[PDB]
């Protein structure tokens, strides 16, 4: 079984890398072939808006932003191992996409 | 060695006045093939006295709304003007620039003293850095007006005005505009 792919995606890096260093540590003690987490670029969802809800003020604007960090980590193992690695270290706020073959 | 545009030597150029010895540009060390060095000459005070004068002329000549950012279109005008100056004078064209900014640099000028609407002038002398800075802009404005509304091109007009200013003739806009400031400063002293 080859090209099993795990994609971690979240909102903040203080919780993304806390989980991203956890599943790559569970696969290491199992003696598997691990590919390092490659960074897939941060998306800056930028929305500018008027502060004033009536449009009378001095034309002041809010630059609201969402930052999306993307991670790609690759494994080469049968599919029962990746399920038991992923299912134990479940952390809210960071989510996992699993593509098989 | 290091020539101006690879052909013109600045080492055989002599500065005449002691008032413009250290505030003048290249004699031995600031020699560059091109003006276009893109250095920072306005970050600190008295950093403009160390840039080459080809930079100062190039930066001053690009002063209009239509061509305020363009610069590669400005170095060719200066190059062509230098070729024309060398054709007329028969010698190093960079000595002509020095002899022209010497005879065009103002020496005495007035000061706005009093209230608004009624000028009451009083003569003060011109600082050497402002003496260097002022003479280029008058040349540029005269070239702008003249080559703005005749057949005559920018480079030809700049070259002929610079040569007539080196000769100190009254047919040049650079030598003209020193005279009004000088004679108003005469009227007050």
């Amino acid at each position: 079984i080859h090209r099993i792919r795990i994609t971690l995606t979240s909102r903040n890096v203080k919780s993304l890398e806390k989980v991203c260093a956890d599943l790559i540590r569970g696969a290491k003690e199992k003696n598997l072939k691990v590919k390092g987490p490659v960074r897939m670029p941060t998306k800056t969802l930028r929305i500018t808006t008027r502060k004033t809800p009536c449009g009378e003020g001095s034309k002041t604007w809010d630059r609201f932003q969402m930052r999306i960090h993307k991670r790609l980590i690759d494994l080469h193992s049968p599919s029962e191992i990746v399920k038991q690695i992923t299912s134990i270290s479940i952390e809210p706020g960071v989510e996992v996409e699993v593509t098989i073959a | 060695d290091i020539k101006l545009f690879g052909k013109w030597s600045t080492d055989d150029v002599q500065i005449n006045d002691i008032s413009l010895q250290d505030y003048i540009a290249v004699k031995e060390k600031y020699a560059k093939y091109l003006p276009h060095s893109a250095g920072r000459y306005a970050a600190k005070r008295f950093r403009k006295a160390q840039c080459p004068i080809v930079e100062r002329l190039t930066n001053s000549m690009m002063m209009h709304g239509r061509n305020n950012g363009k610069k590669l279109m400005t170095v060719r005008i200066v190059k062509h003007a230098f070729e024309i100056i060398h054709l007329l004078t028969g010698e190093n064209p960079l000595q002509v620039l020095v002899n022209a900014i010497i005879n065009s640099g103002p020496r005495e000028d007035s000061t706005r003293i009093g209230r608004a609407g009624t000028v009451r002038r009083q003569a003060v002398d011109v600082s050497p850095l402002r003496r260097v800075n002022q003479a280029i802009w008058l040349l540029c404005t005269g070239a702008r007006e003249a080559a703005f509304r005749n057949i005559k091109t920018i480079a030809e007009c700049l070259a002929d005005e610079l040569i007539n200013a080196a000769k100190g003739s009254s047919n040049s806009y650079a030598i003209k505009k020193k005279d009004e400031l000088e004679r108003v400063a005469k009227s007050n002293r």
Binding site: - | K79, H80, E83, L87, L88, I151, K152, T153, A155, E156
Partner: protein
């Protein structure tokens, strides 16, 4: 005053082209258009013929500024 020029040659213009041009010390289409009261396009078209006849050296040729010099 208003500027009226000649798009083509005149009898006196071509005679001035042969005897006066190689002693200007600056040969420019602007100078020809000023002195000889003709269009600047005609000056360029005459100076190309003068280059073809081998009597005038060319220093710098460009879109706008073209620089000529007399021979020797």
């Amino acid at each position: 005053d208003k500027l009226n020029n000649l798009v083509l040659f005149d009898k006196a213009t071509y005679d001035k082209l042969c005897k006066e041009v190689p002693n200007y010390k600056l040969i420019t289409p602007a100078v020809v258009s000023e002195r000889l009261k003709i269009r600047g396009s005609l000056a360029r078209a005459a100076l190309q013929e003068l280059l073809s006849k081998g009597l005038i050296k060319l220093v710098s040729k460009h879109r706008a500024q073209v620089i000529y010099t007399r021979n020797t």
